[PDB]
């Protein structure tokens, strides 16, 4: 009964979903800053 072995591993970047689009909220702050001005 030959046995006792090993292995190697790899990975994958699964969080492909973009996030930059929802982070460009600056313009709304600019408009409300103008309102407060």
């Amino acid at each position: 009964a030959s046995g006792i072995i090993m292995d190697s591993s790899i990975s994958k970047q699964a969080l492909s979903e973009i996030e930059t689009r929802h982070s460009e909220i600056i313009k709304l702050e600019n408009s409300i800053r103008e309102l407060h001005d």
Partner: peptide, 22 residues
């Protein structure tokens, strides 16, 4: 209108965000 941020990232950072906007 039921939310403002698409929770693609999950995590708490999004949740609070949404509420504030509302």
């Amino acid at each position: 209108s039921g939310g403002f941020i698409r929770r693609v990232t999950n995590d708490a950072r999004e949740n609070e965000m949404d509420e504030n906007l509302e």
